[PDB]
CSV table of all heavy atoms in Angstrom, one decimal:
chain,number,residue,atom,x,y,z
G,151,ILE,N,96.7,107.7,81.4
G,151,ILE,CA,97.3,108.7,82.3
G,151,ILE,C,96.6,108.7,83.7
G,151,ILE,O,97.2,108.4,84.8
G,151,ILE,CB,97.1,110.1,81.7
G,151,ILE,CG1,97.6,110.2,80.3
G,151,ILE,CG2,97.7,111.2,82.6
G,151,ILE,CD1,99.1,110.0,80.2
G,152,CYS,N,95.3,108.9,83.7
G,152,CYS,CA,94.5,109.0,84.9
G,152,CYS,C,93.1,109.0,84.6
G,152,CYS,O,92.6,109.3,83.4
G,152,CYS,CB,94.9,110.2,85.7
G,152,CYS,SG,94.8,111.8,84.9
G,153,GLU,N,92.2,108.9,85.7
G,153,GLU,CA,90.8,108.9,85.5
G,153,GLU,C,90.2,110.2,86.0
G,153,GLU,O,90.7,110.7,87.1
G,153,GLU,CB,90.2,107.8,86.3
G,153,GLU,CG,88.7,107.5,86.2
G,153,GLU,CD,88.2,106.4,87.0
G,153,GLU,OE1,89.0,105.5,87.3
G,153,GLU,OE2,87.0,106.4,87.3
G,154,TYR,N,89.1,110.7,85.5
G,154,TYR,CA,88.4,111.9,86.0
G,154,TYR,C,87.4,111.4,87.1
G,154,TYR,O,86.4,110.8,86.7
G,154,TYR,CB,87.6,112.7,85.0
G,154,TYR,CG,87.3,114.0,85.4
G,154,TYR,CD1,88.0,115.1,85.1
G,154,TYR,CD2,86.0,114.3,86.0
G,154,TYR,CE1,87.7,116.4,85.5
G,154,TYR,CE2,85.7,115.5,86.5
G,154,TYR,CZ,86.5,116.6,86.2
G,154,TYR,OH,86.1,117.8,86.6
G,155,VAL,N,87.8,111.6,88.3
G,155,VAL,CA,87.2,111.0,89.5
G,155,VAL,C,86.5,112.1,90.2
G,155,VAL,O,87.1,113.3,90.4
G,155,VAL,CB,88.2,110.3,90.4
G,155,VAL,CG1,87.6,110.0,91.8
G,155,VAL,CG2,88.6,109.0,89.8
G,156,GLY,N,85.3,111.9,90.8
G,156,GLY,CA,84.6,112.9,91.6
G,156,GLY,C,83.4,112.4,92.1
G,156,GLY,O,83.1,111.2,92.3
G,157,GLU,N,82.5,113.3,92.5
G,157,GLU,CA,81.1,113.1,93.0
G,157,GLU,C,80.1,112.8,91.9
G,157,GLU,O,80.0,113.7,91.0
G,157,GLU,CB,80.8,114.3,93.8
G,157,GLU,CG,79.5,114.3,94.6
G,157,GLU,CD,79.0,115.6,95.1
G,157,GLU,OE1,79.7,116.6,95.1
G,157,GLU,OE2,77.8,115.6,95.6
G,158,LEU,N,79.4,111.7,91.9
G,158,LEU,CA,78.4,111.5,90.9
G,158,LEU,C,77.1,112.2,91.3
G,158,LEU,O,76.6,112.1,92.4
G,158,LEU,CB,78.1,109.9,90.8
G,158,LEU,CG,79.3,109.1,90.5
G,158,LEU,CD1,78.9,107.6,90.7
G,158,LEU,CD2,79.6,109.4,89.1
G,159,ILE,N,76.6,113.0,90.3
G,159,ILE,CA,75.4,113.8,90.5
G,159,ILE,C,74.5,113.7,89.3
G,159,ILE,O,74.9,113.4,88.2
G,159,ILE,CB,75.6,115.3,90.9
G,159,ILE,CG1,76.4,116.0,89.7
G,159,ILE,CG2,76.5,115.4,92.2
G,159,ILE,CD1,76.6,117.4,90.1
G,160,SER,N,73.2,114.0,89.5
G,160,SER,CA,72.2,114.0,88.4
G,160,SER,C,72.4,115.3,87.6
G,160,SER,O,73.0,116.3,88.1
G,160,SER,CB,70.8,114.0,89.0
G,160,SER,OG,70.5,115.2,89.8
G,161,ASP,N,71.8,115.3,86.4
G,161,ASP,CA,71.8,116.5,85.6
G,161,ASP,C,71.1,117.8,86.3
G,161,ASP,O,71.6,118.9,86.3
G,161,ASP,CB,71.1,116.2,84.3
G,161,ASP,CG,71.1,117.3,83.3
G,161,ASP,OD1,72.2,117.9,83.1
G,161,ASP,OD2,70.1,117.5,82.7
G,162,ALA,N,70.0,117.4,87.0
G,162,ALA,CA,69.3,118.4,87.8
G,162,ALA,C,70.1,119.0,88.9
G,162,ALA,O,70.1,120.2,89.0
G,162,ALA,CB,68.0,117.8,88.3
G,163,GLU,N,70.9,118.2,89.6
G,163,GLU,CA,71.8,118.7,90.6
G,163,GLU,C,72.9,119.6,90.0
G,163,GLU,O,73.2,120.7,90.5
G,163,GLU,CB,72.3,117.6,91.4
G,163,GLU,CG,73.4,117.9,92.6
G,163,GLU,CD,72.8,119.0,93.6
G,163,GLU,OE1,71.6,118.9,94.0
G,163,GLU,OE2,73.6,119.9,94.0
G,164,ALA,N,73.4,119.1,88.9
G,164,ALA,CA,74.5,119.8,88.2
G,164,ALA,C,74.2,121.1,87.6
G,164,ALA,O,75.0,122.1,87.7
G,164,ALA,CB,75.1,118.9,87.0
G,165,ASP,N,72.9,121.3,87.3
G,165,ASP,CA,72.3,122.6,86.8
G,165,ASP,C,72.2,123.6,87.9
G,165,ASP,O,72.1,124.8,87.5
G,165,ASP,CB,70.9,122.4,86.2
G,165,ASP,CG,71.0,122.4,84.7
G,165,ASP,OD1,72.0,122.7,84.0
G,165,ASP,OD2,69.9,122.3,84.1
G,166,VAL,N,72.2,123.2,89.2
G,166,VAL,CA,72.2,124.2,90.3
G,166,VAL,C,73.5,124.3,91.1
G,166,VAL,O,73.6,125.0,92.1
G,166,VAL,CB,71.0,124.0,91.2
G,166,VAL,CG1,69.7,124.0,90.5
G,166,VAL,CG2,71.1,122.7,92.0
G,167,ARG,N,74.6,123.7,90.6
G,167,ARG,CA,75.8,123.8,91.3
G,167,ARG,C,76.4,125.2,91.1
G,167,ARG,O,76.6,125.7,90.0
G,167,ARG,CB,76.8,122.7,90.8
G,167,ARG,CG,76.7,121.2,91.3
G,167,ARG,CD,77.0,121.0,92.8
G,167,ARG,NE,76.4,119.9,93.5
G,167,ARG,CZ,77.0,118.9,94.0
G,167,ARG,NH1,78.3,118.7,93.8
G,167,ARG,NH2,76.3,118.0,94.7
G,168,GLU,N,76.7,125.9,92.2
G,168,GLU,CA,77.2,127.2,92.1
G,168,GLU,C,78.6,127.3,91.4
G,168,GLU,O,78.8,128.3,90.7
G,168,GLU,CB,77.3,127.9,93.5
G,168,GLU,CG,76.0,128.1,94.2
G,168,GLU,CD,76.1,129.1,95.4
G,168,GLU,OE1,77.2,129.7,95.5
G,168,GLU,OE2,75.1,129.3,96.1
G,169,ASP,N,79.5,126.4,91.7
G,169,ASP,CA,80.8,126.3,91.0
G,169,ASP,C,80.7,125.2,89.9
G,169,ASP,O,80.4,124.1,90.2
G,169,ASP,CB,81.9,125.9,92.0
G,169,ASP,CG,83.3,126.1,91.4
G,169,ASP,OD1,83.5,125.8,90.2
G,169,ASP,OD2,84.2,126.4,92.2
Side-chain angles (χ1 to χ4, degrees):
Chain G
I151 308 296
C152 56
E153 181 178 339
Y154 198 96
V155 169
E157 183 192 354
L158 301 171
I159 66 177
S160 64
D161 187 50
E163 180 50 43
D165 256 359
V166 305
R167 280 291 154 113
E168 296 197 6
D169 192 324

